[PDB]
């Protein structure tokens, strides 16, 4: 039993809710919140910009030190950093950004990072400003992640379409 509330169960291990991931993180304080990161951990907009704003920019400060030490992530890769006031940990996962021409097949590799964590609160990777089809992202999530994933979808219209079209 965990503290996630109001989710629709899609599969044995995948759950979905219309929710603001920031507000959901602040309420659940999950062990792991997933950020929709880029390789530079520049958290300017989308989910990343919102998560970082909720940490009063502490996420960005920590991230800049990480990059200065380690260099950029790979597309499809991840790193674990602090969850600040939102979660114990933040798993920064880089899905491909279609608006940069990145290979959509890297989306499966990105979701594989979730399997290193037993339970996660997450957005749909490569959705939103990353330019992929969120229905495709949900399909890859379900077909790749084996651990327990609680997906937060900000847009109510999108949420209804994702549920109604789910096979
Ligand atoms: C303040 C605010 O926007 N909070 C949000 N929480 C969620 C779950 C969304 S989402 O449903 O649009 N998913 C989503 C997924 C991936 C990206 C890159 C983007 C972008 N950009 C968005 S937005």
């Amino acid at each position: 039993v965990n503290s996630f509330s109001g989710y629709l169960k899609l599969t044995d291990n995948v759950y979905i809710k219309n929710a603001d991931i920031v507000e959901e993180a602040k309420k659940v304080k999950p062990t792991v919140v997933v950020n929709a990161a880029n390789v530079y951990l520049k958290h300017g907009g989308g989910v990343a910009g919102a998560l970082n704003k909720a940490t009063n920019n502490a996420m960005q400060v920590e991230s800049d030190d990480y990059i200065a030490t380690n260099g950029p992530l790979k597309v499809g890769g991840s790193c674990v950093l602090s969850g600040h006031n939102l979660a114990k940990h933040c798993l920064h996962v880089v899905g491909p950004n279609v608006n940069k021409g990145e290979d959509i097949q890297l989306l499966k590799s990105a979701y594989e990072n979730f399997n290193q964590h037993e339970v996660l609160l997450a957005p749909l990777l490569s959705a939103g400003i990353f330019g992929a089809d969120p229905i495709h992202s949900l399909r890859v999530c379900v077909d790749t992640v084996r651990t327990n994933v609680y997906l937060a979808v900000f847009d109510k219209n999108l949420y209804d379409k994702l549920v109604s079209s789910f096979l």
Side-chain angles (χ1 to χ4, degrees):
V1 180
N2 64 51
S3 158
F4 289 104
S5 179
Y7 285 75
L8 176 67
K9 181 170 179 61
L10 293 177
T11 68
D12 178 72
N13 66 298
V14 179
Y15 296 80
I16 194 164
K17 185 186 184 175
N18 175 215
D20 184 341
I21 193 172
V22 170
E23 278 317 300
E24 185 81 354
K26 280 197 287 195
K27 147 182 135 43
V28 178
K29 284 300 225 83
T31 305
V32 180
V33 67
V34 172
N35 178 33
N38 59 57
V39 296
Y40 307 110
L41 302 179
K42 288 174 60 107
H43 309 302
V47 169
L51 288 171
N52 176 59
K53 179 174 179 193
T55 75
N56 183 42
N57 211 52
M59 178 181 282
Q60 191 64 67
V61 169
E62 179 195 29
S63 292
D64 288 348
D65 171 84
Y66 173 92
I67 297 286
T69 299
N70 300 108
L73 295 183
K74 303 171 178 179
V75 178
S78 69
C79 67
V80 179
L81 289 175
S82 181
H84 300 279
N85 54 317
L86 306 175
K88 189 174 198 304
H89 301 108
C90 180
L91 181 70
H92 295 272
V93 179
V94 184
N97 189 323
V98 175
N99 305 315
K100 303 172 175 179
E102 294 166 352
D103 164 29
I104 194 63
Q105 302 294 137
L106 289 168
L107 187 53
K108 187 171 183 77
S109 299
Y111 274 116
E112 288 170 342
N113 296 285
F114 288 24
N115 290 321
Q116 299 293 318
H117 303 277
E118 290 197 351
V119 183
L120 316 87
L121 171 63
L124 284 170
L125 298 179
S126 295
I129 68 175
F130 281 62
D133 173 9
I135 297 180
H136 175 64
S137 183
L138 178 55
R139 188 73 257 167
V140 179
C141 180
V142 158
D143 295 340
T144 304
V145 181
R146 298 175 302 282
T147 55
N148 295 144
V149 57
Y150 290 84
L151 295 167
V153 177
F154 180 57
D155 187 71
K156 173 57 161 156
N157 188 294
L158 174 59
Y159 172 83
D160 287 348
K161 182 196 187 110
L162 286 167
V163 169
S164 292
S165 62
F166 183 71
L167 220 204

